[PDB]
Amino acid sequence: FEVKKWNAVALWAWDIVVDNCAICRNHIMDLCIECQANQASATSEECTVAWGVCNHAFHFHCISRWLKTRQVCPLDNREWEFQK
């Protein structure tokens, strides 16, 4: 089969910067620092984005650990609640 044309959407951000899970102080694309160690224990699939009202991006482990003893986003002191 051949394709005459196709529309490819792409997302671009400046490579010097990157959205980061500041709780683990690592890349969103990269892993959280607590699963950076002992990485053989967990498959690290559950280290995804937890989008919410704060409109930030985090590793799920880091934000969930923060919500274990806190109740606010670690960038703005707003009531954190998962959205996506």
């Binding site: 003893t69 806190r70 703005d76 002191n77 707003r78």
Partner: protein, 493 residues
């Protein structure tokens, strides 16, 4: 014609005959009516406006020209009522003028023009086009002015507006606020000027601040007021934090004293426009290091995972005199207190020797010492003009203050408000006699209109205060009232 067709025609053709009358009596003469439109809407002839609207809505392409003419006329009345204002009282006059134009034209459209939605949209668009009227090659002058207006309506001024009155006034403020094109700049000034009100204790009442903050939350999205709201919901808990900190003092782990009231106002580093000081590093005065470190521990254990930065920049404190006589309660910025503390240690004060104590940049240290010597708390022992690294200082005993708790520059607002109101009356004294030098006789009610016309670009004059002020010219033998006609007036000159 409609009466005739109802009287003599079957109803199934009622609408056609009236439609066909219009397309032969008010549509084919559209050039005549549309040429008249400019005059018929410019002089606000209300009966003529009503007839014009009832006869123009019928024609298919009849309304738009009148829409455009109303938009232009409202635009002109906006500029004429919002130009060449006094720089002294610009914000209140600006907001009041826009509210007056909006109210009068809402009255005109939705009582005489029948309040068609097209006309209301024209009002909104034109008045938006005037309440962001930038000077050519200049930034828009609306956001800062409305920020100043709100910041004057919320301060504890001597006006003393009642709570219901201030709520109504702030609803009007929302009405005039929904037109500024760059609302982002507006909350950039407002956040800066809400920082002043919630850190110097100048808010009239936290109820009013909460009402205003929550009132922006329905005229703009919750994201728009997130920076604004997080300040108010941080001061309202800060006092509770002072209570909890004093309770932590009451733990009495050791014998602890602060020698000070120590009211603290921790603020959220993100949503507070207070700049994290790039320069002017500071070393805390030794009289207060213990309190600083104990507060740091209290904010550490009782609230884990938190780092402070001790923004001394805006830190305001007060200190008692060193028994120099006439005991005054001296309140200074913490920049000034440390310098004057090292001054208290020894009468001879070298600039270089106080560099070590304060541990700060000289460019604002000179400003602090200059403010100290402006009220002559400190004196320059050397007679050289400015302050160098070798400037000498000591105590100026002979300076006296009429107030013990005297103020260093940042119930006196009552006197200033009376003086401003006096100048309002003083100008009104300097407005009456000009008409007397123009026609020498005017009616009681006709004189009031000339006062407002003379003060069109100035403050709005009160009708009752005219009567009280015009009597000043009577007993001063300037002007007099005719016996036969109370409206008739004359002057001796």
């Amino acid at each position: 014609e409609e009466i005739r067709c109802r009287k003599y025609l079957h109803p199934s053709s009622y609408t056609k005959v009236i439609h066909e009358c219009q397309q032969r009596m008010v549509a084919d003469h559209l050039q005549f009516l549309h040429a008249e439109c400019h005059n018929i809407i410019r002089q606000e002839k209300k009966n003529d406006m009503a007839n014009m609207y009832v006869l123009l809505r019928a024609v298919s392409t009849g309304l738009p020209h009148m829409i455009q003419e109303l938009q232009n006329h409202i635009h002109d009345e906006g500029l004429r009522a919002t130009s060449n204002l006094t720089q002294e009282n610009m914000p209140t006059l600006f907001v009041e003028s826009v509210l007056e134009v909006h109210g009068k034209f809402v009255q005109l459209i939705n009582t005489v023009l029948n309040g068609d939605q097209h006309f209301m949209s024209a009002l909104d668009k034109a008045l938006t086009s005037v309440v962001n009227y930038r000077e050519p090659k200049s930034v828009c002058k609306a956001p800062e002015l409305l920020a100043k207006y709100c910041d004057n309506l919320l301060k504890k001024s001597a006006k003393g507006m009642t709570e219901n009155e201030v709520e109504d006034r702030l609803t009007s403020f929302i009405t005039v606020f929904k037109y500024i094109d760059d609302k982002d700049v507006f909350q950039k000034f407002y956040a800066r000027m809400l920082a002043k009100r919630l850190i110097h204790g100048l808010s009239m009442s936290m109820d009013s601040e909460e009402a205003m903050i929550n009132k922006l939350k329905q005229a703009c999205g919750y994201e728009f007021t997130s920076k604004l709201h997080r300040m108010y919901t941080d001061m309202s808990v800060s006092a509770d934090l002072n209570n909890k900190f004093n309770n932590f003092i009451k733990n009495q782990d050791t014998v602890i004293d602060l020698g000070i009231s120590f009211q603290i106002y921790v603020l959220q580093a993100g949503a507070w426009p207070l700049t994290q000081a790039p320069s002017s590093t500071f070393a805390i005065p030794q009289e207060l290091e213990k309190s600083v470190q104990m507060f740091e521990l209290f904010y550490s254990q009782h609230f884990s995972g938190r780092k402070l930065t001790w923004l001394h920049y805006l830190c305001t404190g007060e200190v008692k005199m060193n028994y120099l006589g006439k005991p005054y309660v001296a309140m200074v910025t913490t920049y000034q207190m440390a310098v004057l503390l090292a001054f208290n240690n020894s009468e001879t004060v070298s600039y270089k020797e106080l560099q070590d104590s304060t541990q700060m940049n000289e460019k604002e240290l000179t400003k602090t010492i200059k403010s100290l010597l402006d009220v002559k708390m400190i004196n320059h022992d050397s007679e050289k003009e400015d302050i160098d690294a070798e400037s000498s200082f000591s105590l100026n005993m002979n300076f006296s203050s009429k107030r013990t708790k005297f103020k260093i520059t940042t119930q006196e607002m009552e006197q200033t408000r009376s003086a401003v109101d006096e100048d309002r009356k003083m100008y009104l004294q300097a407005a009456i006699v000009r008409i007397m030098k123009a026609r020498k006789v005017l009616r009681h009610n006709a004189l009031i209109q000339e006062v407002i016309s003379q003060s069109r670009a100035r403050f709005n004059p009160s009708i009752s205060m005219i009567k009280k002020c015009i009597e000043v010219l009577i007993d001063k033998q300037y002007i007099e009232r005719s016996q036969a006609s109370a409206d008739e007036y004359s002057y001796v000159a």
